[PDB]
């Protein structure tokens with residue numbers, strides 16, 4: 189059994205040298221024997237590789253003392269309905285130097301906000317993991333033709349995540365001490381969260397007694413929604429996947445049974461609006 | 474398309490550490506909460522007639538150690554996250570790490586908690602003869 193988390197999406201025909209491979213699975217077949225690996229003097233390391241690593245397949249089901257759970261129950265989400273922010277990501281496919289993973293392209297929220305990002309990925313190199321722009325193409329469908337112009341209207345992720353923290357703070361400062369992302373088939377949204385979410389123990393804001401909802405890499409500080417100016421990371425968010433509540437078909441068909449005022453304009457924010465709308469109707473009626 | 478690098482047993486620990494602000498503290502806390510150590514490391518088949526040095530260009534395990542590929546013993550490499558040194562480069566990746574056999578069940582945790590003597594090249598507390 190293998191997982192798709194951290195799948196090597198490069199087109200390099202060989203595996204990695206034992207000293208460079210993060211795992212036994214990724215070691216080149218030349219070095220494998222008796223359930224172990226061997227060093228073969230004369231076969232050198234590769235000092236120029238750039239291997240795209242897939243961030244699809246995260247499982248947030250850890251049980252660690254002092255660390256809150258990201259995925260909350262339906263009953264805990266209802267208590268925090270003020271913190272609900274629907275979230276959906278439309279992505280693009282990795283191309284040219286890599287194939288096998290999706291990258292965030294359009295990030296939509298139930299606030300009507302759409303933020304476009306430069307196709308960026310996590311690339312393993314002989315020294316480290318380089319968070320950098322990668323070649324990408326929109327999905328081949330005609331229902332995704334609106335994504336073609338977006339491939340050149342994107343912002344670098346350092347800017348994008350500052351905008352997300354800013355939008356969430358403006359929206360939630362007078363509503364909640366949390367954010368609950370309301371999702372539908374959470375997989376890709378959770379992948380996107382790797383680009384702007386940080387987790388850890390419950391902390392307090394540096395300027396007040398309210399719990400921390402933001403983090404700053406520049407200063408290694410934490411802040412609430414009121415004091416988050418310049419902060420780049422969403423800290424300790426909560427979330428729930430509406431799709432896992434027993435629904436049969438797609439998002440729009442389940443949404444349309446209770447609501448007729450949120451039409452499908454096909455953009456990420458419309459799916460985010462529909463997700464939060466469906467969650468409110470299913471939970472409070 | 475693509476070639477997998479991971480097994481399902483590591484999904485929870487790597488997902489948790491890949492999102493943390495302090496990944497080192499997150500791993501130590503994960504182990505303290507009963508979590509299983511990171512598995513799927515690159516363990517080497519070697520003669521065990523090595524020098525016993527901690528980080529080497531070839532496997533140097535002695536009779537009381539196990540040799541591993543350095544990238545597979547590094548939490549930062551395993552999670553594909555930033556390395557904590559200012560240059561952002563790895564000190565284990567590209568080399569072989571010798572772990573005492575008694576600690577070989579958790580080579581990622583061993584390299585996270587221990588330090589190598591910059592004089593004799595052996596791990597402090599596990600081979601470093603000098604004080």
Ligand SMILES: COc1ccccc1C(N)=O
Pocket residue numbers: 272273274298299359360363464
């Ligand atoms: C603060 O909540 C709102 C207010 C107006 C429109 C949308 C939202 C929302 N979170 O979806």
Ligand SMILES: [Mg+2]
Pocket residue numbers: 276277278456459
């Ligand atoms: Mg969508």
Ligand SMILES: [Zn+2]
Pocket residue numbers: 393394395396397398411412413414415
């Ligand atoms: Zn505050």
Ligand SMILES: [Zn+2]
Pocket residue numbers: 443447448449450461462465466
């Ligand atoms: Zn609606």
Ligand SMILES: [Zn+2]
Pocket residue numbers: 544547548549550551556563564565566
């Ligand atoms: Zn490393």
Ligand SMILES: [Zn+2]
Pocket residue numbers: 590591592593594595601602603
């Ligand atoms: Zn020493």
